[PDB]
Design a protein around this ligand. Structure first.
Ligand code: CL
Ligand code: CL
Ligand code: CL
Ligand code: MG
Ligand code: MG
Ligand code: RB
Ligand code: RB
Ligand code: RB
Ligand code: RB
Ligand code: RB
Length: 136
RNA sequence: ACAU
DNA sequence: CGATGT
């Protein structure tokens, strides 16, 4: 219904899917970029969306912030809730980096606690999430 | 079908 | 048009 403006919004950007993956987090109210991941040579949209949420959790925990996180990814929200990224991407030498980061993100979720609400950004009602890359 |  | 996911 109502956007919670006091929040962090995250999104993935890619060149190809699977392809080059990056992600960023922004203050929902101002658009200020708060973190950006260096591009990863091969990943999927959903792996990137998952990493972006987990990085948001870690970012907010380190800063003692109780703000919620918005993501537009039904898939990534579920994977974080499950603490398990159920990606179909082949595990091979060219995908080793993304899978390392996904494995490390799951490991962090399994060893840390958080109360951060992870909320669905309602694109159909509100437009593109504020962390979007503007490539579509 | 819905979400990317 | 192709892809990733529930
Ligand atoms: Cl990461
Ligand atoms: Cl909330
Ligand atoms: Cl959801
Ligand atoms: Mg997205
Ligand atoms: Mg986007
Ligand atoms: Rb803390
Ligand atoms: Rb986009
Ligand atoms: Rb977009
Ligand atoms: Rb979207
Ligand atoms: Rb589909």
């Amino acid at each position: 219904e109502e956007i919670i403006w006091e929040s962090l919004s995250v999104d993935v950007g890619s060149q190809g899917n699977p392809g080059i993956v990056e992600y960023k987090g922004v203050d929902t109210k101002t658009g200020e970029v708060l973190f950006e991941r260096e591009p990863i040579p091969i990943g999927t949209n959903n792996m990137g969306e998952f990493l972006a949420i987990v990085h948001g959790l870690r970012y907010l925990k380190e800063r003692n912030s109780r703000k919620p996180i918005y993501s537009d990814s039904q898939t990534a929200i579920k994977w974080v809730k499950d603490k398990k990224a159920k990606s179909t991407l082949v595990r091979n030498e060219e995908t080793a980096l993304i899978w390392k980061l996904v494995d490390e993100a799951e490991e962090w979720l399994n060893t840390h606690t958080y109360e951060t609400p992870i909320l669905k950004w309602q694109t159909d009602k509100w437009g593109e999430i504020k962390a979007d890359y503007g490539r579509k």
